[PDB]
């Protein structure tokens, strides 16, 4: 049961590292995207 | 011994019904029970005149509690003496009912009793103007039970500091 949250935390790390990179990129070019 | 919880069906139905057509009227079944069983005993203090003012202030959301980083001590009380209960304790919080009449000193025990009631009204109000969307009825119910549990304990002199 505890091996699922350890691997599920490595997944979150990966998703979040992705969101950071892409958001950084989006601002370096077309920040218009991040508007509500 | 294990710690469990089961909703009292009588209480559950009373609430689930009130949520569907929420009112702040003191005389409805839902609030009346809580008024008599929880609120009234909680807001019962030595100086009963000021106490009844606080009860009205709480219902109006006009009551406020500040910590303390020209008046006198007969009405307001002071740092070493609580205004609500005649007790002598270090008072680290002070109450304001206005529109402030005066700033009144409060013992930690009083603060716990009053906030417990203010928390109840606060959540109830959130529902009346709800404002409570993503929480299902079972969760909300058990929130009210929690809110009451706090008042039930403060009622009896069990508080947190």
């Amino acid at each position: 049961l505890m091996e699922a949250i350890q691997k599920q935390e490595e997944i979150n790390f990966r998703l979040q590292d992705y969101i950071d990179r892409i958001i950084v990129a989006i601002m370096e070019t077309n920040p218009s995207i991040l508007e509500v | 011994v294990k710690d469990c919880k089961e909703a009292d069906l009588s209480l559950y139905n009373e609430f689930r019904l009130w949520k569907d057509e929420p009112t702040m009227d003191r005389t409805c079944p839902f609030l009346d029970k809580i008024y008599q069983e929880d609120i009234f005993p909680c807001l019962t203090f030595s100086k009963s005149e000021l106490a009844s003012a606080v009860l009205e202030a709480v219902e109006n959301n006009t009551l406020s509690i500040e910590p303390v980083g020209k008046a006198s001590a007969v009405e307001c009380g002071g740092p070493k003496k609580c205004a609500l209960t005649g007790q002598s304790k270090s008072c680290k919080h002070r109450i304001k009912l206005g529109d402030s009449s005066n700033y009144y000193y409060i013992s930690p025990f009083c603060r716990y009793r009053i906030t417990s009631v203010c928390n109840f009204f606060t959540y109830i109000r959130y529902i009346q103007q709800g404002l409570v969307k993503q929480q299902d009825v079972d969760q909300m119910f058990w929130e009210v039970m929690q809110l009451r549990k706090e008042m039930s304990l403060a009622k009896l002199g069990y508080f947190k500091e």
């Binding site: 969101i19 601002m27 509500v36 | 006009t62 406020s64 910590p67 009053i114 203010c118």
Partner: protein, 176 residues
């Protein structure tokens, strides 16, 4: 369609997680509040235009996750910010304590001359107040920050908060 604006000011929201940044944003920009609002993922901004000294100001309010240490995506966040709303929770003293740490990031990663306003939010919780107004206003005055208490929930001073920081930015940008 007249969408014109005379000045475009970027203002960033900073402060401890849960002080209500995202709701200050929604309250000002779309007059909406969410009691159940969740933690902010990624980075966003919404815009609103106002009149200041006859000139129209288009405000660009940026918001991001209140949890910040290792983000490194912060350089981009503060870049071009001419104003900052530094937010704490009146009812959680810890969030006021960390205001100093936030001033650090501003003095490190953000431009100087950036207008900084201290905002005490959740003024609507009257019985829970942990940070007396005077102590904050004092800290604000000595540290060169504006100060106001807002409630995203009942709307008090939210409008006022933005009108204030936006006009202080006007005066500095028009003068130089």
């Amino acid at each position: 369609r007249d969408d014109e604006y005379d000045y475009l000011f970027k203002v960033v929201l900073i402060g401890d997680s849960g002080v209500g940044k995202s709701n200050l944003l929604s309250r000002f920009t779309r007059n909406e509040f969410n009691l159940e609002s969740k933690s902010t993922i990624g980075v966003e901004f919404a815009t609103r235009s106002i009149q200041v000294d006859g000139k129209t100001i288009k405000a660009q309010i940026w918001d991001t996750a209140g949890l910040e240490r290792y983000r490194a995506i912060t350089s981009a966040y503060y870049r071009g910010a001419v104003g900052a709303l530094l937010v704490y929770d009146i009812a959680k003293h810890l969030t006021y304590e960390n205001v100093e740490r936030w001033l650090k990031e501003l003095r490190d990663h953000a431009d100087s001359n950036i207008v900084i306003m201290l905002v005490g939010n959740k003024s609507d919780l009257r019985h829970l107040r942990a940070v007396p107004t005077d102590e904050a206003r004092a800290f604000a005055e000595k540290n060169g920050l504006s100060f106001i208490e807002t409630s995203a929930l009942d709307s008090t001073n939210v409008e006022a908060a933005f009108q204030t920081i936006l006009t202080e930015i006007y005066r500095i940008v028009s003068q130089k």
